[PDB]
Amino acid sequence: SNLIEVFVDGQSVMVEPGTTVLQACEKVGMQIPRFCYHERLSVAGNCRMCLVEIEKAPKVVAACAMPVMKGWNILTNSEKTKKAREGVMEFLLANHPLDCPICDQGGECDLQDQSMMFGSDRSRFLEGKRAVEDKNIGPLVKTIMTRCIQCTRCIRFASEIAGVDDLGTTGRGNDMQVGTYIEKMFMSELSGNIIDICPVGALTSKPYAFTARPWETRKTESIDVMDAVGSNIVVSTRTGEVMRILPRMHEDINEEWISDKTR
């Protein structure tokens, strides 16, 4: 074989060559915080949340991209790893709008959860926040780009899985905006998965807008009958009333996507 031995917090595990630090930590049972990394999208490495300190090395590496080699010890809960996570989340929340009560992502927001779990507890920001002009991409996805953190999952999904090539990043520096640069409607058969894979409330569901909250919906696993694929789904209801339909993880049929007719 070709298994190499790596150490996660001193625990020895076997990994294949080319395996990143994030996958090794997932193999031992640790979940690295991540924003721009998705297991089915390409590796981008532009959010710097997955920074972890390899011991005997005075520079944190990106766990979502850096492969492991023999003898590497990964300190997933060291002091400088936590300091790096706190600094990255401070920079992420420097310009975020105070829109949590008016947000459809509230209660199921990734940013809120790892800010409660890995971020700091108060703010040192004192200046004016930025504002981004909202774009229209269709009657299926509601777009509020003041909440986008430029994670570039839109572009990767539209360029690799949807195969449309209609989303991009126009601008430079702090004024970089994810959009289409013109009044163009992103209309494909898989246009709800960008709602699914947006870590923030920038791309929300237009028919679902302002209807329920994630902590109260009862989730029941069911089977899609719209097509012959047999997609496994979750129907989330509220007091005997169907509210929304989400995909289910099933690597043999519909790995984590569904068509928008199902949704």
Partner 1 sequence: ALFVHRDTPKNNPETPFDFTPENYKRIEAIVKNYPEGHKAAAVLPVLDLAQRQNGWLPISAMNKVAEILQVPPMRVYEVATFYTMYNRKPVGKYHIQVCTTTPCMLRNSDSILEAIQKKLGIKVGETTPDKLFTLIEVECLGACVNAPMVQINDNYYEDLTPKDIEEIIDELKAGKIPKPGPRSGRFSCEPAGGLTSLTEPPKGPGFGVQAGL
Partner 2 sequence: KTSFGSLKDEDRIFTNLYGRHDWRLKGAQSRGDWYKTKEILLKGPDWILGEVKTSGLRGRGGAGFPTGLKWSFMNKPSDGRPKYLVVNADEGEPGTCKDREIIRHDPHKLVEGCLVGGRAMGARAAYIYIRGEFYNEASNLQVAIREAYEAGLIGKNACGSGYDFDVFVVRGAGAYICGEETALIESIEGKQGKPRLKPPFPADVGVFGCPTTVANVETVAVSPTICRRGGAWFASFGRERNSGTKLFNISGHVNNPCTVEEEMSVPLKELIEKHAGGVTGGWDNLLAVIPGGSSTPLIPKSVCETVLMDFDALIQAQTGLGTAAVIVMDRSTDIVKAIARLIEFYKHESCGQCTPCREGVDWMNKVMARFVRGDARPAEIDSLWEISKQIEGHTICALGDGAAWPVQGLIRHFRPELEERMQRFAQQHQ
- What is the chain's alpha carbon radius of gyration, rounded to the nearest angstrom? 20
User: Which is it for strands 4-8 and 73-75: parallel, antiparallel or unpaired?
Assistant: parallel
How many residues touch partner 2 under the rule CB under 8 A: the total is 33
Query: Which residues within the stretch 136-155 sit at the binding site for ligand SF4 (CB under 6 A)?
Result: 147-154
User: Which is it for strands 141-143 and 203-205: parallel, antiparallel or unpaired?
Assistant: antiparallel
**In angstroms, what CA-CA distances link 180 with 44, 91, 114, 187?**
20, 26, 29, 12
Stretch that binds partner 1, among 57-65, 76-84, 173-181, 195-203 (CB under 8 A): 173-181
Stretch that binds ligand SF4, among 2-10, 15-23, 67-75, 109-117 (CB under 6 A): 109-117
Q: Does 168 sit near partner 1 (CB under 8 A)?
A: yes
Query: Which residues within the stretch 25-84 sit at the binding site for ligand FES (CB under 6 A)?
Result: 34-37, 45, 47-50, 62, 64
Query: Which residue's entry shows tokens 């237009």?
Result: 206
Question: Helix, strand, or coil here: 24?
Answer: helix
Among K ion, partner 1, ligand FES, none, the one that 198 touches (CB under a kind-dependent 5 to 8 A) is K ion
Between the two ends of the chain, the Cα-to-Cα distance in Å is 44
Query: Which residues within the stretch 97-136 sit at the binding site for partner 1 (CB under 8 A)?
Result: 133, 135
Q: Give the residue, chosen from 100, 145, 176, 234, that forms a contact with partner 2 under the rule CB under 8 A.
A: 176
Which positions touch K ion (CB under 5 A)? 198
Do the Cβ atoms of 179 and 167 come closer than 8 Å? yes
Among ligand FES, partner 1, partner 2, none, the one that 68 touches (CB under a kind-dependent 5 to 8 A) is none
